[PDB]
Every structure is written in structure tokens, then in C-alpha cells.
């Protein structure tokens, strides 16, 4: 299969202009499609996950145009719920930010649509969202395994009292929040127990407000939504650079800098992953904050032991950065790593051991003891963009690393290796 071998990188230094945020991009596209008016999105991410959303919108009849680099998108809002019949199949790759929000949104009114995706997506849970949608009136059928895509959506979500489990995925609540305002009746969304990864709910509410809708958030335990609302185009909207994508570059400087500055995100960002910078600071790196940048400068690197549920995606970057830290690092409260692009606790533990680390794969945590020196390994990537990006950091040592299926980074960051190369220096 395809592979890329990264030569040892002596030092990193430079500036990277970040690709757009995947989380913001897919929310903005769906809201723009539902909204009245023309929305112009700039700094939109061009990656597999966004392409699947764009293709779904095209299939649903939404009109839009894209600039040459696909980062500027002019969307003609539909002025209401999207519709299709005949069990139209929408193929969503392995994009959770397309699958979960569309699973909910397409329950408005009548419809006959099928949502499916890659094999792994048929193994990523969606039952708790389906349960909630059904409580609100939706008719949903599991075409294969109960609790997983593919789903046949036949509409009917009118609102009412809806309970949802948010203990493993915040995306189920996000999907309900974006959908409820357009339902004919008011909706009260009750969180069954605890809610995981709260920052993504804040991103959803932030985007909804940009598109003209606000709801009543009762300490994240219950959300009161008024029905009969309409989303409205914000005119021109700038998509923040991706803070999760930024993690690799900031960590690279913490390990081998130099100073690396990422632009497109700053202290005012709505993304929870900007807090990844705080972790590097706790490890001994220096961080500088700007309006539209975050930079990291090499200091030292000490192991840490902390809960990472607030930044599950960027947290993976700490797992490989730990190979360069002094002491044993423990990342806790990351059970949900198991239900993402791959089971990341199993994958991270397996690949880290290949370069020499002693690793304890806990059920919901990972403990990493770095080796005195890293060794060469051919890293398996599990169709997971972040496995490829996290392990690229192994090359900030005296050993090269070979990454299998490097193009898997395209899920969120097609140009990843060219960007890492941009800040890689020989002297
Ligand atoms: O709502 C979102 O945008 C996301 C939430 C989390 O599940 C993340 O793990 C996922 O990558 C994106
Ligand atoms: O980006 C990540 O690290 C995990 N994404 C899961 P998805 O966006 O497919 O729901």
C-alpha cells in the first residue's frame, strides 16, 4: 500500500496559516443550507469530511459555488428543512459531523433518505441520537446493525420532550440542538446523565446564534428550544482555522523548536482545542497568544498526568509528544477515543510500542513511558488522519519513521505533510 517516510527533522520553526476548522465548517454548511438568504463562507476547510457534506447538500438540491481552492463557498439557503424522497442514499464517508447532524436534521417534515458511509462509520454508535429523535416523533429504521448507520429516515420529528444520552458523544446533542429550532413544536432536551466534551456544544450554540437562533441552556443539563424558528444567513462568515490541526505544529515546536506560530486561531477562538496550548505550557513549553495566532516556543518537556476529555482530539498529539518528555505521561478520561475514526486507545498503544515506548492501554486512559531512544517503525494508521499526523512527530528525533497510508490525513488536512515540511529545518 501507500507509505511515506519522514526523515529526521533537526529543528522546527516558522508560521503556518491553518486550514479551516472541520467542526465549524460542517456546522456552517448545514446551517447555511437550512437558512434563508445567501451565505458566503470563507476559510472553509477542503477535506474529505467537508466534501461529503457538500456532496450531500448537492444531492439534496442545495445550490452553491466554490472558489478554485474550495475555501470560499457561496451557499443559496433553502429557507427551511432539506428534502428528498425515494430513499436517496447519502454517502458520508466517516464524517461524524455530517452523519450525526444530518441524521437529526433530515427528520424534519417528511422525507425518505438513507444515510450511510464507510465500513467504520457503520461501527460508530448513533443509537442514542436515534432514541432521542424517535421520542420527538421521528421515524428511523436501522438498515443493518441496530444502533449504527446506515439509517433510513422517514421524517416526523415535531418536537416535545426529548431525552438524550451525552455521556459518550456530544455530537448527538449537537445534532438535536441544530434541528429542534425548525421543528413545529417547542422541544425540551434533557441530558440523561453526564455530558462529555462540552466545548463542542459551545461551538454548536455559537454557530446557531450566528445563524440567528438562540436557545435556553440550563447548566448543560437541559436545553429549552422554541419551535417554529428560521435560520438566517449571516452574510459573510469567516471559518476559524482548525485548532485540532494546529496541535501538531505547536507540539512540534514544544519538542524541537524554535518557535512555531499558527495563524487563523487565537485567544478568542470558540474551539476547545485551543486549550491544547495550555497542556504544552504545563509540560514546559512557552506559549504566546494573539488575536489571530498562537505560537509555541521550545522550553522543556516534562510528562503530565491529566484528564483530557475536554480536548479528546488534540489530546492524541500529547500521546506522541510524550515520547520526548521526561517521565511517564498519563492521559485520562478518554474512553470516547474508542468510538472515533478507529479505537484510538488500542491504535495509539499499539503504534507507540512499535517505536519503543512501554505503554499501558487502560480501558479509558493511556500511560506512556518513553524509551531512552526511539527506534524505527512502520506505523499503521487505521484509516485515521490523526494517527498519521500524531506519528509524524516521531521524526523530530534521530530516527526516521514510515507512515502507512499518509493520504488518510485528507479526512481533515490534505496538505498536512507539506505544511509540516514548511516548518521543518535542517539547521
Ligand atoms: O462536534 C464536533 O465537531 C466534534 C465532536 C467530537 O466528537 C470530536 O471528537 C469530533 O472530531 C468533532
Ligand atoms: O477529528 C477527529 O479526531 C475525530 N472525529 C470524529 P468525527 O468528526 O468523524 O465524528
Amino acid at each position: 500500500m501507500e507509505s511515506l517516510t519522514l526523515q529526521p527533522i533537526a529543528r522546527v520553526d516558522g508560521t503556518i496559516n491553518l486550514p479551516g476548522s472541520k467542526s465549524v465548517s460542517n456546522r456552517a454548511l448545514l446551517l447555511a443550507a437550512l437558512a434563508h438568504g445567501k451565505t458566503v463562507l470563507t476559510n472553509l476547510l477542503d477535506s474529505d469530511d467537508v466534501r461529503h457534506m457538500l456532496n450531500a447538500l448537492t444531492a439534496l438540491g442545495v445550490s452553491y459555488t466554490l472558489s478554485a481552492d474550495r475555501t470560499r463557498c457561496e451557499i443559496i439557503g433553502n429557507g427551511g428543512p432539506l428534502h428528498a424522497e425515494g430513499a436517496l442514499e447519502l454517502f458520508l464517508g466517516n464524517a461524524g459531523t455530517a452523519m450525526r447532524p444530518l441524521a437529526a436534521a433530515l427528520c424534519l417534515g417528511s422525507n425518505d433518505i438513507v444515510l450511510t458511509g464507510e465500513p467504520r462509520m457503520k461501527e460508530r454508535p448513533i443509537g442514542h441520537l436515534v432514541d432521542a429523535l424517535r421520542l420527538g416523533g421521528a421515524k428511523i429504521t436501522y438498515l443493518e446493525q441496530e444502533n449504527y448507520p446506515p439509517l433510513r429516515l422517514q421524517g416526523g420529528f415535531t418536537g416535545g420532550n426529548v431525552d438524550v444520552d451525552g455521556s459518550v458523544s456530544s455530537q448527538f446533542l449537537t445534532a438535536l440542538l441544530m434541528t429542534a429550532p425548525l421543528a413545529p413544536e417547542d422541544t425540551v432536551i434533557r441530558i440523561k446523565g453526564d455530558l462529555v466534551s462540552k466545548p463542542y456544544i459551545d461551538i454548536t450554540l455559537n454557530l446557531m446564534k450566528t445563524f440567528g437562533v438562540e436557545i435556553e441552556n440550563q447548566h448543560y443539563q437541559q436545553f429549552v428550544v422554541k419551535g417554529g424558528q428560521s435560520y438566517q444567513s449571516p452574510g459573510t462568515y469567516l471559518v476559524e482555522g482548525d485548532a485540532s490541526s494546529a496541535s501538531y505544529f505547536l507540539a512540534a515546536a514544544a519538542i524541537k523548536g524554535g518557535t512555531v506560530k499558527v495563524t487563523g486561531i487565537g485567544r478568542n477562538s470558540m474551539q476547545g482545542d485551543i486549550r491544547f496550548a495550555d497542556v504544552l505550557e504545563k509540560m514546559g513549553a512557552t506559549i504566546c497568544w494573539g488575536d489571530d495566532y498562537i505560537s509555541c516556543t521550545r522550553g522543556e518537556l516534562n510528562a503530565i498526568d491529566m484528564d483530557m476529555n475536554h480536548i479528546p482530539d488534540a489530546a492524541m498529539t500529547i500521546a506522541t509528544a510524550a515520547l520526548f518528555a521526561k517521565g511517564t505521561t498519563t492521559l485520562r478520561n478518554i474512553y470516547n477515543w474508542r468510538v472515533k475514526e478507529t479505537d484510538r486507545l488500542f491504535a495509539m498503544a499499539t503504534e507507540l510500542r512499535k517505536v519503543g515506548a512501554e505503554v499501558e492501554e487502560g480501558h479509558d486512559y493511556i500511560r506512556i513511558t518513553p524509551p531512552e531512544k526511539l527506534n524505527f517503525a512502520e506505523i499503521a494508521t487505521y484509516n485515521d488522519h490523526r494517527m498519521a499526523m500524531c506519528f509524524s512527530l516521531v521524526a523530530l528525533s534521530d530516527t526516521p519513521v514510515t507512515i502507512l497510508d499518509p493520504k488518510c490525513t485528507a479526512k481533515t488536512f490534505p496538505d498536512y505533510f507539506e505544511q509540516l515540511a514548511r516548518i521543518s529545518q535542517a539547521a
Side-chain angles (χ1 to χ4, degrees), residues 21-24 26-27 49 96-97 100-101 124 168-172 174-175 196-197 199-201 203-204 244 273 311-314 336-337 339-341 344 385-386 411-412:
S21 161
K22 174 251 283 167
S23 293
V24 173
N26 273 352
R27 285 171 173 71
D49 286 357
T97 61
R100 280 66 174 274
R124 289 181 63 194
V168 164
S169 175
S170 66
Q171 292 184 33
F172 305 154
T174 274
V196 71
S197 306
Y200 288 102
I201 299 305
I203 293 179
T204 298
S244 305
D273 277 8
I311 52 167
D313 295 357
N336 58 23
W337 270 21
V339 304
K340 289 175 190 295
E341 281 81 338
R344 293 163 156 179
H385 54 138
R386 297 204 194 287
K411 190 165 188 288
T412 59

Side-chain angles (χ1 to χ4, degrees), residues 11-44:
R11 194 183 169 91
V12 294
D13 192 277
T15 301
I16 296 292
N17 304 311
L18 297 168
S21 161
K22 174 251 283 167
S23 293
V24 173
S25 289
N26 273 352
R27 285 171 173 71
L29 286 170
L30 175 53
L31 294 176
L34 291 164
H36 291 72
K38 177 168 64 61
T39 298
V40 173
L41 300 178
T42 63
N43 205 226
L44 187 69

Side-chain angles (χ1 to χ4, degrees), residues 45-64:
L45 173 63
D46 174 21
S47 77
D48 300 340
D49 286 357
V50 179
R51 184 178 73 251
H52 292 309
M53 173 64 85
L54 286 166
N55 290 161
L57 297 180
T58 292
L60 289 168
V62 179
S63 288
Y64 64 77

Side-chain angles (χ1 to χ4, degrees), residues 165-200:
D165 189 328
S167 69
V168 164
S169 175
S170 66
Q171 292 184 33
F172 305 154
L173 176 59
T174 274
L176 288 166
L177 289 169
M178 293 192 296
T179 294
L182 308 191
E185 311 299 338
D186 295 349
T187 303
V188 175
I189 303 169
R190 191 291 291 298
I191 304 310
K192 286 179 168 185
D194 284 71
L195 175 59
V196 71
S197 306
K198 165 182 302 174
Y200 288 102

Side-chain angles (χ1 to χ4, degrees), residues 5 96 104 112 120 166 171 179 189 208 212 245 278 321 373 382 387 401:
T5 298
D112 189 354
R120 174 67 179 166
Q171 292 184 33
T179 294
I189 303 169
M208 286 168 58
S245 298
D278 300 19
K373 68 172 170 56
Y382 306 77
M387 283 298 294
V401 61

